[PDB]
């Protein structure tokens, strides 16, 4: 039985931070659903790459629960995730069932908006730190990937492979992560 | 006047190797056209990410010439590039006008198919070396990015940022590449 990942894709998402995790998680044999926040229609990402989601978020939620919920970054995509009641509900449910939540770059600021994971050690993009830390609800880290139990965060486009492989390791183990890593030609 | 990049997107392309260069080159202020080999329709990449191109290749060629032509990898995407007479013509024209050609992972094997850049030092993904080297028409390198004048090659998903920044440096200079690099949180 394979594990399953939900990647929530909003307008203005960082496309690298969306595609690198989708691709690497699929390389691990984990089922990934790319779910469009707004509906089934194509999504215009932050640098104008247009990605067609697999399903609407409304429909994807009906097929869960998922072993991980992944939030890409991009400032505007993270704000759209932060403003969504649908996202609030999915994250609350995932937290309540003790499932993994992973967010990168500005993505962790949607955890703040939805009051998810307070008391965890987290990282973000440097430029998103102040937003994430408003109120002191998390403990900040400069690690390129941070994991404090079921809240897994990372910093930017250039940490996306590390982020994705950390997700793979958390769900499928260190050996699978190592096997997936080698053909990527990481340094 | 900004420089311009053509990224040719075929079915089976490696989506990370497509999106990372598009995004990073756009961050450099270079105009990028994502051109669909088959037409204007969405493209199903190697790990099932679906990307909507900006234009068909037929239409994009009408708006050139471009300061760089970029060939993503992915075995099946590279084979589709290798089989295309339209791609042959674009690459031949680009070579004839002394314009940069950049290819990553399996992408350089389309240079072999179209007889482009023989005598250059090149790299590829390790698993694409034998195909690239059939006939000894290139000199192989294990550098993560190789550039021998106007032929710029790289190895895999994990070298895509380095590849893209090398393209940026070749077109816009080292200072712009450094400015674009810092916010990415590369190691």
Curated annotation (Swiss-Prot), chains A, B:
What drives induction of this protein's expression?
Answer: By hydrogen peroxide and UV irradiation. In pancreatic islets, expression increases under hyperglycemic conditions. Expression is also induced by sulforaphane, an isothiocyanate obtained from cruciferous vegetables.
The organs and tissues expressing this protein are described as: Highly expressed in pancreas, kidney, skeletal muscle, liver, testis and heart. Detected at slightly lower levels in placenta and brain (at protein level). Detected in astrocytes, Sertoli cells, spermatogonia, spermatids and spermatozoa. Expressed by pancreatic islets at higher levels than surrounding exocrine tissues.
- Please spell out the taxonomic lineage of the organism that makes this protein: Eukaryota, Metazoa, Chordata, Craniata, Vertebrata
List the NCBIfam families: not_thiJ (TIGR01383)
Describe how the cofactor binds.
Answer: Deglycase activity does not require glutathione as a cofactor, however, glycated glutathione constitutes a PARK7 substrate.
Q: How does it sit in the membrane?
A: Lipid-anchor
- Domain of life of the organism in this record? Eukaryota
Any one Gene Ontology biological process term?
regulation of neuron apoptotic process
The protein's name is Parkinson disease protein 7
**Family to which this protein belongs:** Belongs to the peptidase C56 family.
- Crosslink Glycyl lysine isopeptide (Lys-Gly) (interchain with G-Cter in SUMO): position given as 129
Q: How does it assemble?
A: Homodimer. Binds EFCAB6/DJBP and PIAS2. Part of a ternary complex containing PARK7, EFCAB6/DJBP and AR. Interacts (via N-terminus) with OTUD7B. Interacts with BBS1, HIPK1, CLCF1 and MTERF. Forms a complex with PINK1 and PRKN. Interacts (via C-terminus) with NCF1; the interaction is enhanced by LPS and modulates NCF1 phosphorylation and membrane translocation. Interacts with NENF.
User: Per the UniProt entry, what species is this protein from, by scientific name?
Assistant: Homo sapiens
EC assignment: 3.1.2.-, 3.5.1.-, 3.5.1.124
Give residue numbers for the site Cleavage: 148-149
């Amino acid at each position: 039985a394979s594990k399953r990942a939900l990647v929530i894709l909003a307008k203005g998402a960082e496309e690298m931070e969306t595609v690198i995790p989708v691709d690497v998680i699929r390389r691990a044999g984990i089922k990934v659903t790319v779910a469009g926040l707004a509906g089934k229609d194509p999504v215009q990402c932050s640098r104008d790459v247009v990605i067609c989601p697999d399903a609407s978020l409304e429909d994807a939620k009906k097929e869960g629960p998922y072993d991980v919920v992944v939030l890409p970054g991009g400032n505007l995509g993270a704000q759209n995730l932060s403003e969504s009641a649908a996202v609030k509900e999915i994250l609350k449910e995932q937290e309540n069932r003790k499932g993994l939540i992973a967010a990168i770059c500005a993505g962790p600021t949607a955890l703040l908006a939805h009051e998810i994971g307070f008391g965890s050690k987290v990282t973000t993009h440097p430029l998103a730190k102040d937003k994430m830390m408003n109120g002191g609800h998390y403990t900040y880290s400069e690690n390129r990937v941070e994991k404090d139990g079921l809240i897994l965060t990372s910093r930017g486009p250039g940490t996306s492979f590390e982020f994705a492989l950390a997700i793979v390791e958390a769900l499928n183990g260190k050996e699978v992560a190592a096997q997936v890593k080698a053909p990527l030609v990481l340094k």
